[PDB]
Structures are given as C-alpha cells and as structure tokens.
Amino acid sequence: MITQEMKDLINNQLAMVATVDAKGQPNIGPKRSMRLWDDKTFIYNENTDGQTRINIEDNGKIEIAFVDRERLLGYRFVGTAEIQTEGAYYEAAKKWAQGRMGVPKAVGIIAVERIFNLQS
Amino acid sequence: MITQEMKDLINNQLAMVATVDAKGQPNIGPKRSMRLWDDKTFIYNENTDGQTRINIEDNGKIEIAFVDRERLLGYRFVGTAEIQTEGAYYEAAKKWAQGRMGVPKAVGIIAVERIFNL
C-alpha cells in the first residue's frame, strides 16, 4: 500500500500530525519518532503527553503529512489511531527508544486507510 | 502578541494548516501564501477548491503550525477562519498575488486566538 516512493520521502521529512479534540478544535504536532511499523501501519513514541495523545484517545481520528519542501511534493495519510501503554506495540517502541531517546510514556499506532499526495 | 522570532518563522517556514470536516476527520495541508495581515490576523491566498477550504467554510476551526527543523523550534496558532470571494480582504489578496502567483480563487482570513510553543 505504502510504496517505496512514499517510504523514501517519509524517511527524510518531519511528520506533522493533525488530530481534533472533543470540541472540534484541530491540533498539529510534529512527531520526530513517527515511522513505519509495516506497510499499512505507522507507529510513534509518545514522549510529550500533550494534545495529540488526548485527541487520539478521545476519538482516534488522525492525518499525518510529510512535505518535501525542495519540490513541494509530499504524502498525507488518513487513518485511525490509538494510544497504548503496554503490550507488543509499546514494547517494540520501548526497545526502539533505547539509545535514541527516553522511555516512551506511551506508543501511538496509526492504521492507514487512505493516502493522498499534496494536490487538490 | 506576535513576537519577532514568531515573525521570523512565519516568513521563513512553511505554514502547515490543520482543519476538520463535518464528520470530525482532521485535514492538514501546506499553504505557501500564508502571511501576517497584522499582529492579530493571518491571511492566505486560496488557490484551490480543496479540503482545507471546504473545512474552513464548514466550521471555521483552524490551527496553523510553523516548524524550524534546524533549531527544533516552532509555533502553533489557534484561531477562527473564514473564506471570502469578494471585498476588501479579497482585493488585498488579489493585489498581493500580482507578480507572485495566479489570481486567487478566494482569500482565507484567520483571527488569531491563542499561541503555543513547540
């Protein structure tokens, strides 16, 4: 689903994560740790315990954008997300953080449902 | 209000614009023409019939982010937005576009309400 073309662009750019709270206010947060779990799933390490984690638990709806500013090319990923603090996803994230950053407060997981580029 | 370092990021970084549709699905996309109209207001040139435009028209809810990857610094601007296709803001947008881009289809105006650090 997520192609090699998408992966290369992803690997270079900063993930910008958009969510929405209970009152319908959008939130944007960069997530440096965002990465592919497999070719249909994103995973990131939740280090901040901020509005992104709240919104994900609140309603799960999410979009992630990556923009290549050298050509204004990019990809956007619409999916459903959840936050977990124990279990396989969390343990993988905990393993991944060793050497890179601190122990994750939680892990965020995003199941990709639709993929757009920057057009329209 | 809007500090000089905020203006540095606004003028040098790419505006990432988050909105939401009637069903609660967030949307996000870049707007190269996003700029300070004054110390309390953003405006940008709407060149599309895209989802960002539709969402602002629907409910006016918005957040704009700017990120300097180089210094790991950023700002989030919370506000309420509207789309206009005629009038003073639109005329100003149309004038600004001359020598920069095509004639705008519309203008987006955002009243800033709160500012956050990243």
Residue numbers in the entry:
A (entry chain B): 1 to 120
B (entry chain A): 1 to 118
Study authors write:
Hence, spy49_0662 was expressed with a 1.4 kDa C-terminal V5 epitope tag used for Western blotting followed by a His6-tag for immobilized metal ion affinity purification, and the resulting protein was coined as HupZ (heme utilization protein Z). This protein shares some protein sequence similarity to the members of the IsdG family.
The H111A variant was crystallized in the P6522 hexagonal trapezohedral space group, and its structure was solved and refined to 1.98-Å resolution. H111A in complex with heme was EPR silent, as observed in the binary complex of wild-type HupZ, indicating mutation of His111 did not lead to an observable change of the heme-center electronic structure. The difference in SEC between the heme complex of wild-type HupZ and the H111A variant suggests that His111 is exposed to surface or involved in subunit-subunit interactions; and thus, mutating such a polar residue facilitated the formation of high-order oligomer structures. We noted that the H111A variant had similar activity comparable to that of wild-type HupZ, suggesting that His111 does not contribute to the observed activity.
